[PDB]
Every structure is written in structure tokens, then in C-alpha cells.
Amino acid sequence: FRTFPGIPKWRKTHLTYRIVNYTPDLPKDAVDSAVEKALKVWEEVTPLTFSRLYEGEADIMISFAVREHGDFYPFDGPGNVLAHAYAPGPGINGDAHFDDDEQWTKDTTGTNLFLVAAHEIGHSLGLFHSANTEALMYPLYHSLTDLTRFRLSQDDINGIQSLYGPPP
Numbered sequence: 817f818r819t820f821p822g823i824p825k826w827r828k829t830h831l832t833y834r835i836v837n838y839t840p841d842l843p844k845d846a847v848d849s850a851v852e853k854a855l856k857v858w859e860e861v862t863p864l865t866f867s868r869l870y871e872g873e874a875d876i877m878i879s880f881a882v883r884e885h886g887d888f889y890p891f892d893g894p895g896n897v898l899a900h901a902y903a904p905g906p907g908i909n910g911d912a913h914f915d916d917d918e919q920w921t922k923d924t925t926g927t928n929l930f931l932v933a934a935h936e937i938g939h940s941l942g943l944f945h946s947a948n949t950e951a952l953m954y955p956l957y958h959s960l961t962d963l964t965r966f967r968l969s970q971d972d973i974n975g976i977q978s979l980y981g982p983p984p
């Protein structure tokens with residue numbers, strides 16, 4: 817696994833998130849579920865905990881955007897870059913942006929929202945890309961036969977625990 821340079825990490829264990837807007841691709845329920853599950857994957861193996869905010873500024877602001885959307889890194893239309901997220905810190909740091917020129921799915925027929933969110937949240941928490949191909953943090957989007965037995969790899973667990981420790 818890899819962390820970001822200087823090992824930027826959150827310096828509190830309780831983090832807030834907010835879902836700023838919703839893709840037309842999916843029911844709102846399936847967006848909330850995918851995000852909740854992606855946060856849970858990391859919560860399970862650390863002492864971090866998350867709560868949703870419906871107004872004000874949360875640590876991890878989550879949104880769907882296309883092309884120019886408010887930062888210096890425009891999205892690129894269908895395929896290729898699916899989403900991007902910033903390392904831990906104030907303001908835009910921590911935030912995760914999802915390219916709505918992708919077709920977001922609950923399953924693996926388009927681009928799976930849970931899997932890409934779990935990966936991007938890994939960045940929001942301080943993990944950079946892994947060299948390990950089995951790792952959630954490996955760069956490459958991997959459709960893969962069966963999301964149902966999804967497991968974070970030991971590599972992902974090792975990286976995130978190197979930052980925040982194991983559950984208490």
C-alpha cells in the first residue's frame with residue numbers, strides 16, 4: 817500500500833460526510849447505500865466513525881459532476897477517469913467527486929458506485945495507490961465476477977491501520 821507524501825491524515829476519529837447532490841442514474845436509496853457501505857468497509861478495520869450531515873460543511877463532501885465542476889481537474893466524459901478524491905485536510909481536501917458521464921449502477925452492468933466510492937474514500941482517508949492487484953486501492957477499475965464476496969485486502973487493511981490503527 818502507499819500513503820500520500822507527508823502522510824496527511826485526519827487528526828480526529830469522528831468524521832462527517834455530506835451527499836451534496838444525486839445522480840439521475842440511480843434511486844437516491846441506492847446512492848445512500850453505496851456510500852454508507854463504502855464508509856463501513858473502512859470503519860470496520862479502524863477506530864474511525866462517520867456521521868451524515870444534511871447541511872453545513874462536512875469533512876467529506878460527496879458530489880456528482882461532469883467536465884468543469886469547480887476545481888482544477890475537469891472530468892473527461894464517458895469512461896477513463898471515473899471519480900477523484902482529495903487527501904485528508906480542510907475545505908476541498910477529503911472531498912470525493914464522481915463523474916456523472918459514467919452510468920452508475922448498483923450491480924456491475926455499468927460502473928459500480930459502491931466499489932468506486934470505497935476506493936475514493938480510501939483516498940479521502942489518506943491512502944494513495946497500492947501496487948497490489950488484489951487491493952481495493954489498486955488504480956484499475958476492475959468489474960470482476962462477484963461484488964457480493966467483496967473483501968478489503970490485507971494490503972488495504974495494513975495501509976489504513978498504519979495511519980489510524982486497528983479497531984479499539
Ligand SMILES: [Ca+2]
Nearest residue numbers: 875907909910
Ligand atoms: Ca472537505
Ligand SMILES: [Ca+2]
Nearest residue numbers: 893895897915
Ligand atoms: Ca470519465
Ligand SMILES: [Ca+2]
Nearest residue numbers: 916917918919
Ligand atoms: Ca451518469
Ligand SMILES: [Pt+2]
Nearest residue numbers: 872873874877
Ligand atoms: Pt461542502
Ligand SMILES: [Zn+2]
Nearest residue numbers: 887889900913
Ligand atoms: Zn473534482
Ligand SMILES: [Zn+2]
Nearest residue numbers: 935939945955
Ligand atoms: Zn485511486
